[PDB]
Amino acid sequence: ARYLGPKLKLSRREGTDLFLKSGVRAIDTKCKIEQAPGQHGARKPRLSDYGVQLREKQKVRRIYGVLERQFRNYYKEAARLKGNTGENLLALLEGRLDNVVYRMGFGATRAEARQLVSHKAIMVNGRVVNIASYQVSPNDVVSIREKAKKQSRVKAALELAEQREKPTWLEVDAGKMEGTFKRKPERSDLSADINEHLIVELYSK
Amino acid sequence: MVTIRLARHGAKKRPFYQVVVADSRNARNGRFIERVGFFNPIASEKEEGTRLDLDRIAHWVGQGATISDRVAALIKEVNKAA
Amino acid sequence: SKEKFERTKPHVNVGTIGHVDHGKTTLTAAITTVLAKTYGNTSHVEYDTPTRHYAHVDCPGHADYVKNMITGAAQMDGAILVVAATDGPMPQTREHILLGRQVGVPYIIVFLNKCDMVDDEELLELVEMEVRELLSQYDFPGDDTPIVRGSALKALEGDAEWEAKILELAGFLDSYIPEPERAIDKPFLLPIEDVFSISGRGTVVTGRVERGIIKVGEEVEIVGIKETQKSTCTGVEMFRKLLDEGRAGENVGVLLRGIKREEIERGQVLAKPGTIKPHTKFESEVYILSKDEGGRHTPFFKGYRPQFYFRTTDVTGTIELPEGVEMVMPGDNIKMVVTLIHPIAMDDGLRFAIREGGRTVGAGVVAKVLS
Amino acid sequence: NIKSAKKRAIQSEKARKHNASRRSMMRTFIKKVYAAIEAGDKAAAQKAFNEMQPIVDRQAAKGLIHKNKAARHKANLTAQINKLA
RNA sequence: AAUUGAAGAGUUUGAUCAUGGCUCAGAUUGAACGCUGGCGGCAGGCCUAACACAUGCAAGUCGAACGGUAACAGGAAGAAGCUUGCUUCUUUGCUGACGAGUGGCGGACGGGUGAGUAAUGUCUGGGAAACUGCCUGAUGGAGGGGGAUAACUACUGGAAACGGUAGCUAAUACCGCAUAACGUCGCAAGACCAAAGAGGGGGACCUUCGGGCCUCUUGCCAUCGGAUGUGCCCAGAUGGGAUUAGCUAGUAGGUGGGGUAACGGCUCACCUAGGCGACGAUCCCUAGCUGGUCUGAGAGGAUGACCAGCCACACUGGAACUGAGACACGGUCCAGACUCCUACGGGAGGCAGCAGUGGGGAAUAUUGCACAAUGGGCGCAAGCCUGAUGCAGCCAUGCCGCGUGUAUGAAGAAGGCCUUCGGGUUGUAAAGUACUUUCAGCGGGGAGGAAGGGAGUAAAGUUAAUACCUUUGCUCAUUGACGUUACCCGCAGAAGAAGCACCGGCUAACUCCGUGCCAGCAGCCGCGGUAAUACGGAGGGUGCAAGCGUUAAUCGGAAUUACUGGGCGUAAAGCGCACGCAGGCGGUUUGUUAAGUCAGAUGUGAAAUCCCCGGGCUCAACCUGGGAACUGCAUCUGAUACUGGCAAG
Numbered sequence A: 001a002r003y004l005g006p007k008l009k010l011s012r013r014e015g016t017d018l019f020l021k022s023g024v025r026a027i028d029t030k031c032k033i034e035q036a037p038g039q040h041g042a043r044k045p046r047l048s049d050y051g052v053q054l055r056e057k058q059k060v061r062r063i064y065g066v067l068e069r070q071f072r073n074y075y076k077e078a079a080r081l082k083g084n085t086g087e088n089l090l091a092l093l094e095g096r097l098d099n100v101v102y103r104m105g106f107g108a109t110r111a112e113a114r115q116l117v118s119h120k121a122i123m124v125n126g127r128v129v130n131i132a133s134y135q136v137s138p139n140d141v142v143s144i145r146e147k148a149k150k151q152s153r154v155k156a157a158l159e160l161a162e163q164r165e166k167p168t169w170l171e172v173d174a175g176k177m178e179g180t181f182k183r184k185p186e187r188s189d190l191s192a193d194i195n196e197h198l199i200v201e202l203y204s205k
Numbered sequence B: 001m002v003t004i005r006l007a008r009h010g011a012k013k014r015p016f017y018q019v020v021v022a023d024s025r026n027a028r029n030g031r032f033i034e035r036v037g038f039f040n041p042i043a044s045e046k047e048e049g050t051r052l053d054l055d056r057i058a059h060w061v062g063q064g065a066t067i068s069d070r071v072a073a074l075i076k077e078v079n080k081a082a
Numbered sequence C: 001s002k003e004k005f006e007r008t009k010p011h012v013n014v015g016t017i018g019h020v021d022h023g024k025t026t027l028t029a030a031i032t033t034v035l036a037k038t039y040g041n042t043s044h045v046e047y048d049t050p051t052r053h054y055a056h057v058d059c060p061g062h063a064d065y066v067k068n069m070i071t072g073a074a075q076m077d078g079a080i081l082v083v084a085a086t087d088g089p090m091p092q093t094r095e096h097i098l099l100g101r102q103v104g105v106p107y108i109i110v111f112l113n114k115c116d117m118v119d120d121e122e123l124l125e126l127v128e129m130e131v132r133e134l135l136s137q138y139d140f141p142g143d144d145t146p147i148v149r150g151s152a153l154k155a156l157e158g159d160a161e162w163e164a165k166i167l168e169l170a171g172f173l174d175s176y177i178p179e180p181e182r183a184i185d186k187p188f189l190l191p192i193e194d195v196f197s198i199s200g201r202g203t204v205v206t207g208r209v210e211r212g213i214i215k216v217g218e219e220v221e222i223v224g225i226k227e228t229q230k231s232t233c234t235g236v237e238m239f240r241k242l243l244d245e246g247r248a249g250e251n252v253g254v255l256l257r258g259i260k261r262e263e264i265e266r267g268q269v270l271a272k273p274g275t276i277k278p279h280t281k282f283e284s285e286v287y288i289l290s291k292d293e294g295g296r297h298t299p300f301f302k303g304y305r306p307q308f309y310f311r312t313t314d315v316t317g318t319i320e321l322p323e324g325v326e327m328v329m330p331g332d333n334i335k336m337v338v339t340l341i342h343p344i345a346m347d348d349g350l351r352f353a354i355r356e357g358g359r360t361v362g363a364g365v366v367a368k369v370l371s
Numbered sequence D: 001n002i003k004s005a006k007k008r009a010i011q012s013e014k015a016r017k018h019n020a021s022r023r024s025m026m027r028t029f030i031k032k033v034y035a036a037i038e039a040g041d042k043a044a045a046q047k048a049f050n051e052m053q054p055i056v057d058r059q060a061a062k063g064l065i066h067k068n069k070a071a072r073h074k075a076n077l078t079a080q081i082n083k084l085a
Numbered sequence E: 001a002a003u004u005g006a007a008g009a010g011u012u013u014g015a016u017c018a019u020g021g022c023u024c025a026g027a028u029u030g031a032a033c034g035c036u037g038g039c040g041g042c043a044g045g046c047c048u049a050a051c052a053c054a055u056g057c058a059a060g061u062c063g064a065a066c067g068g069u070a071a072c073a074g075g076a077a078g079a080a081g082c083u084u085g086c087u088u089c090u091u092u093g094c095u096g097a098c099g100a101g102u103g104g105c106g107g108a109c110g111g112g113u114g115a116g117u118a119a120u121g122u123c124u125g126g127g128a129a130a131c132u133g134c135c136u137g138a139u140g141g142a143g144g145g146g147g148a149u150a151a152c153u154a155c156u157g158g159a160a161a162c163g164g165u166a167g168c169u170a171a172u173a174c175c176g177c178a179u180a181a182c183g184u185c186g187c188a189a190g191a192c193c194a195a196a197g198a199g200g201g202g203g204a205c206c207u208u209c210g211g212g213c214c215u216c217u218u219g220c221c222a223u224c225g226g227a228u229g230u231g232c233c234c235a236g237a238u239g240g241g242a243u244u245a246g247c248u249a250g251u252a253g254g255u256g257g258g259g260u261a262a263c264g265g266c267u268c269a270c271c272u273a274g275g276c277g278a279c280g281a282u283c284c285c286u287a288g289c290u291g292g293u294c295u296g297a298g299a300g301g302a303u304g305a306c307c308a309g310c311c312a313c314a315c316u317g318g319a320a321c322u323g324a325g326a327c328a329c330g331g332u333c334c335a336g337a338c339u340c341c342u343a344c345g346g347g348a349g350g351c352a353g354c355a356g357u358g359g360g361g362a363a364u365a366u367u368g369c370a371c372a373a374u375g376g377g378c379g380c381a382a383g384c385c386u387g388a389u390g391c392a393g394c395c396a397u398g399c400c401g402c403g404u405g406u407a408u409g410a411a412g413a414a415g416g417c418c419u420u421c422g423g424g425u426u427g428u429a430a431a432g433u434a435c436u437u438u439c440a441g442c443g444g445g446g447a448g449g450a451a452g453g454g455a456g457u458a459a460a461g462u463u464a465a466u467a468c469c470u471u472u473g474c475u476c477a478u479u480g481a482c483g484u485u486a487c488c489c490g491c492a493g494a495a496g497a498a499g500c501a502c503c504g505g506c507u508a509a510c511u512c513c514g515u516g517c518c519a520g521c522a523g524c525c526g527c528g529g530u531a532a533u534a535c536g537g538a539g540g541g542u543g544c545a546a547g548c549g550u551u552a553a554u555c556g557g558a559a560u561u562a563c564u565g566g567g568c569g570u571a572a573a574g575c576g577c578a579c580g581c582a583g584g585c586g587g588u589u590u591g592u593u594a595a596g597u598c599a600g601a602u603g604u605g606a607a608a609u610c611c612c613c614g615g616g617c618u619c620a621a622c623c624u625g626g627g628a629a630c631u632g633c634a635u636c637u638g639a640u641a642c643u644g645g646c647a648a649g
Ligand SMILES: C/C=C\C=C\[C@@H]1O[C@](O)([C@H](CC)C(=O)NC/C=C\C=C(/C)[C@@H](OC)[C@@H](C)[C@@H]2O[C@H](/C=C/C=C/C=C(\C)C(=O)c3c(O)cc[nH]c3=O)[C@H](O)[C@@H]2O)[C@H](O)[C@H](O)C1(C)C
Pocket: C070, C074, C098, C099, C101, C102, C103, C104, C138, C139, C287, C291, C292, C293, C294, C295, C309, C310, C311, C351, C352, C353, C354, C360, C361, C362, C363, C364
């Protein structure tokens, strides 16, 4: 059950650079976007504790498209594994196939990448998959089948892909719609817009 | 009587057979004596899925374990002694 | 449940609603015995005429049993007026013929018992003429109706003449009742009229299939008083005989799975899923006349609380009328809105009966539904 | 029913009759041997033991009570008789 | 790389501290209920009445045991209405087969339920005093007989169940004889005690011209062992109660007999008068136990859902027989209740098996398909059947996954609501433009579960033998309920698919209208007496999502039974005081014992499950390989510091 509904209000509920819609139509602070000025605009009640942690969990979940139960399963797997629980959780979240497509550029938005993955616009190692929860291993290759080539869907996504920067672990060619995933990311390369140990504290509670 | 036979333990529509030495008075899923190995029907025939212990099979046959049709068929499928 | 019934000689329903203690049960038993000999509470006996297979319903002739008798006659395709030739017409007989005409029984056959109890050849003709005049004056057919005289209890005694007479009675019964019309066009529907609990089998519900067919293993929906639920049929039967499909128009017993005797009462309907939905208020046009059509005389007003009899049962209801009618004086050809307590699955064009004080006031046809 | 139990029942009854007859005759032979032993005789007791030995051993070989049962009574009887004979 | 390990908050009071209980924030279940609800995979589905049951089925097989033929495919012994080729009658009991019947085997296994049972149960570790069909290896034998008896006949008691009469009556049924070792008794000597021979080829040796005989498949009588399923005994552990302190005399033991497949008061006769018990005897209540499961960092607490091992049970109770293996789960006898049938002479029954019905309950399933695969039992074998099992149906009962769409669009329209009357707001939300069509749905193609076995044959052993049989391969057909297979490919359109709870602090979420301690919410604090972010409604936000809330039970927070890890002057708590037994502990030094303790090694801790490293189902759920762990238990050898046994001070 992928989330569906308003997105600008969803983003302004927290107020961050979570991510935006792929199309842009006057995306700026025209009059009221996230910190609405004029006669009102109370943005933060400033809750004492566990509230910022809940907000971080919610923004993480809505960015990645994952539900609460699956996110908690991922957290439990990360805690069971070695290393740091937060980075292991972020590694699993990025290894989710939909985020791989989004960061490779074939998905204009993360929701669009999930839609494509469901509609079988993606293949891994020469095999179709219709699960946005698949975990990719290092040193792998993920291709796009010939049917998804003729999609203005994908053309716009690949056009918008090259306006951003590029990651440490993905190398994608659009002459064949194929991307090699070499290594796994880390907190250094990941955006520093959230805290992981607060989330760890919350579900360890 | 003591015999070597196959017991089913896999999930629905994906069976899994274990070859084992068990007295005939017990059931298929019932108790046994000594495990011998497994034979996967689907077998995922890129990797393994067929592992029998011919030494234990021979030792129990020497003591009186009656070979079953499926065990003999699996032996003929893999090899007499290889 | 050990006989595989053959759907030959299409089923026709015949009901005896004759006079009380005048030989209805004896007459139907004699008919069954003579037919099974020469051919090899509501009592539902059956017999296979060479022409058509008939189910004979001996209904209670008591006035207090009129409520179930309404369904027994609506269930019925041909009426047999069983009356003594030594007493002639009776108030009970007149009430029964009025009820039969109000429920809409087309074909009626008159039978005169105690033929040999009268040593004359004029009193029998006098009483036959009297009952014929009664029929002709109470909006019934006339000289084109087979009238049957004879003894109803001597038909079981060792004889030949009365056996031939009752065989001739059965013959023109099957002659005067032609192949009836059946309504197997729309999805399956069966109003319930009785419930039995078979030990080892389950709950079975009896009734006449209003429309559609029922195959063994089909899903059906129970719709009716306070409840709309689902169920599955297993083992369609009829008169303790094995069946394969159930057509419309014959009284059959359908076995339901997951049915509670106290939870399922009379008044509900077994329909196909998603066909009809129960309602508590609906709009209908009334057809009451001035004084000589059952309706009362004094100009009653709003708040009237009559029983609205339907295919199965009845319920006390209230009536509201649109503006323009200060009084609801008899002579109501207008349309009004009727609200009922118990919801019953209904459709447009349904004909119901308005009754009160043991007498029918008027008719009504469903026009729209307000749920 | 037409199950095998009825045939099993009648076969069991017939076997019961046969085994009861054999056990009863063996018990009577053993009783006579014991009566000879307790009476104080020494040669007749030996003769009775030598007469009872073949029948009890034959029944044990046929397999109706036990080979060990036959061996134990033979041992008890010989231990009784050899004390005085 | 195989336990790296722990949250608090509110509430006594005008405020503080402490004690102390109450409540809440988490998991989890065989869950129930209310609302809602699209699909698929996996698992689960009478916890209560071991309450009572209609109906159908679950254990038959073997003609290669036998006398037989009721069948009837009937070629065929014979005849023909003689459809111009094969059709019909007693069918010769005659083949293949088969009704019953005798006979061998499993019906003591498969399956289900925890009523009973506090040790006769179960787990762990030990033993001897014993058995064992089917599976085996070795040693040896299979000779000649006799008499039973079923079917069947007819008489005929009965509605049936079942019967008496005479044999026909055969064997691998039964019983003597030839015998007696490796067997049993006995110190030997001696005695005892055994079988069954069936099927096939037919060379030919003779030839009852089938047969013995060359013979293969066997099966059978005995012994010695293995394996196996057991029976028996001991030690430790395994619930509550002392408002349960004596119990027991077949009870404790011995002497002999009997009995048990074996030990033993198991039993008998006698003698001895003990035995058990404060470490809880006896008695009462409750209870299936274990591997495990849940909750926990841990020690701990609860429990025995699914599955596996064991025990006990089959309407209640008692008893025995057959059988190696039962006091017998679809064998037998009898007492009692209930139900049913009867011709009123008399008979049948026990769903805690699969389903299914009545009753109970908060509450839980279809009277399906199949031996297709495995397994089970029978048989030369093909082959029989299996409600075991596998698949199918319903239920969101639990876990997992996917889908309801993606950018647009400022017009910050419509309409709802609020406003310091500017505007905001649901709100980019919708329409649109481009689409993708996952999964529903329609139509096609379509893997695999299938390994076997059977028909021919090539080669090898067996024997004049290529007869006959068996074994190593090759050609021939088959062998799926699941299953409109999984899956894939095409098809029009987002077109066919979202709800629940909460919004005063605990805890994530704010405004209006109306009622006015009223109606009403709630787990607590606590609200609600005209202005309720708390009540009812509305608007709008938050938390989960085909699932959300209430309730039911366990633990945690509760350090609130605390051994790790509490306290007793004033909160609950030092007996009113003293003596003293059993009991607990014990000053200093030496020697000696190895008991407690420590070390090393062995076996074992069933499998399953947790965990770790991997693998396959589109990843997962799920399944599976290996490893560790299961901290336990017993045994062999050392250590002598400490506690302790013994000897000295
Ligand atoms: C009677 C109750 C149950 C009926 C059930 C339902 O009836 C019906 O709804 C029915 C609708 C037609 C109904 O409502 N009937 C129920 C209610 C309404 C009654 C219907 C029919 C009438 O018409 C107004 C009906 C008598 C009508 O009169 C005509 C002639 C008149 C006859 C004389 C008798 C009458 C009266 C009379 O007052 C009278 C008289 O005048 C002189 C002497 N002494 C009398 O006593 C003709 O004969 C028609 O038949 C359907 O038949 C359904 O199928 C139904 C069976 C479900």
